[PDB]
Design a protein around this ligand. Structure first.
Ligand code: KJI
Ligand code: KJI
Lengths: 304, 304
């Protein structure tokens, strides 16, 4: 039935997007209840970003300096406060489109959808994974800051990410909705080392299970391996070591296909050692790692 | 700044999704104004699909046999009619969430977003291209029929696709919103030849331009070619012949990067003849063809 890099339907998040302007800086804000959440660097100019003292910069700002616009209507700001790297702008109006929501701090290797916005307007939606090095490989231009990452469980939107920075390497960094950066990144225009990015092994295996379910099975072999043998190969190819927790999470996929997790590990071991030999898996010529075992189950069962 | 397979924000389409049930068959409908559009095979059972006489099947159906539910509310059906392969159910209530919309019949090689739905509920959104052989490589399970493909220009939703069939080959077929199938496909569970699928050359070139803009330039070479020389190579590798119209559409990308279209064709010629040599372009190990020149411009400029 096909397998696609699917994002969650973004409607519930679109109704929360606002434009936040402070001075000459305009970025996106997330309006939930009577609070607008945005990156605190909205108070910075291009030159302030080199070494900003956010506490000192914010002291020169009053409620009337934060211009919040939701579509064509202006929100009245009645409070402002900084929480880690996010500003919380209390407005006098609760967002009538506020969905049921939670703020969650996701784990590296987990996936989420990103609603890229400019001037408080949504332009696109795509599915991302938080890399093991806590960066995301997104698509963000000047003005995209404040764009959010989220997951949806039936009617509840779990916000997990807010975009803040583009590192000199072209990868992206941001925070959870409490303003805490994922990784060692800071909201300062300085050289920031994004460590070694490893491949999310459990996700590659989940995607191999999705491939078998959807017809792609050329890579299945007559071999098996052990967790320790597989991890020797995984280390060599900069893959995250596979744990018994990862094996357990792959349990439903192993049960559905009848292919034991360690047998799938042996297929992955051979793909790592021999490459794809000019072939593809689910329309890809590389090992895809941005589908969790939960994503594979969800897509293969049609969870709405 | 990164480059992602971005879909349009699906909010405007989510508010149009309804569940249509006829007999024991349930699929998705598109509610716009006082009309619900759905595949006419909603009137078929599993056995009817082998050789259905839609006119005869529809005659045994009355307005009260079509159960349309939008969320938790039931729509009253006051009219029903078949237009090509779609049923148009006139309801007594205009959809209050009807966006500004158009029905457009896209060209092969063009792209669009798909809002996959089950029981009238959205589960995911992904970006597709209508293949040159008029199939789409989607992600659709039982119940996904009636899910729609669309494009968005500021506030206007152009609906281009409605999902109808999964061919025995695992690829998908459907119609425009007037019920006309893309390609030679019929809404009958029979063997249907999806012809040779070619690579959308103009899209690969547009994606190579996106790669250069975003930093990936290893594939740029000291060579040039002509349209005829390039098309000899394109024919050998089952690529669509490049025309002067395609060169003209790539004009803005050629202007932005300073790389002439024929020079980009020479890079593509060498990638076709020599492969990627174990390297990647925009995180892909194959030549991506599901980004039009318009998509590349839109994403690189941040059109909301
Ligand atoms: C440009 C971009 C693209 C993708 N993702 C993120 C960004 N920008 C950043 O990393 C942060 N940049 C800025 C933070 C605060 N004030 C700023 C004021 C003027 C200009 C830039 C500012
Ligand atoms: C299964 C699927 C997955 C992805 N895309 C499409 C489909 N199904 C089809 O091609 C059409 N199938 C059916 C059309 C009408 N009535 C039907 C009644 C019972 C069962 C199936 C019916």
């Amino acid at each position: 039935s096909g397998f696609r890099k699917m994002a969650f339907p973004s409607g519930k998040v679109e109704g929360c997007m606002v434009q936040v302007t402070c001075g000459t800086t305009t970025l996106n804000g997330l309006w939930l209840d009577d609070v607008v959440y945005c990156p605190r660097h909205v108070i910075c100019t291009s030159e302030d970003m080199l070494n900003p003292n956010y506490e000192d910069l914010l002291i020169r700002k009053s409620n009337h300096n934060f211009l919040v616009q939701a579509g064509n209507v202006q929100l009245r700001v009645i409070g402002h406060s900084m929480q880690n790297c996010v500003l919380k702008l209390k407005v006098d109006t609760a967002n009538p489109k506020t969905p049921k929501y939670k703020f969650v701090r996701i784990q590296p290797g987990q996936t989420f959808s990103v609603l890229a916005c400019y001037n408080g307007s949504p332009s696109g939606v795509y599915q991302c994974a938080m890399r093991p090095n806590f960066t995301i490989k997104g698509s963000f231009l000047n003005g995209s800051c404040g764009s959010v990452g989220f997951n949806i469980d039936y009617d509840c939107v779990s916000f997990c990410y807010m975009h803040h920075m583009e590192l000199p390497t072209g990868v992206h960094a941001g925070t959870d909705l409490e303003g805490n950066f994922y990784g060692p990144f800071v909201d300062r225009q300085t050289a920031q080392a994004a460590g070694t990015d490893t491949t999310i092994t459990v996700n590659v295996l989940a995607w191999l299970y999705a491939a078998v379910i959807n017809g792609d099975r050329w890579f299945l072999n007559r071999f098996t391996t052990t967790l320790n043998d597989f991890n020797l190969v995984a280390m060599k190819y900069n893959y995250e070591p596979l744990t018994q927790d990862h094996v357990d999470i792959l349990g439903p996929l192993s049960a559905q296909t009848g292919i034991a997790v360690l047998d799938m590990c042996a297929s992955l071991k051979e793909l790592l050692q021999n490459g794809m030999n000019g072939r593809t898996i689910l329309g890809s010529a590389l090992l895809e790692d941005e589908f969790t075992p939960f994503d594979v189950v969800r897509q293969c069962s049609g969870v709405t």
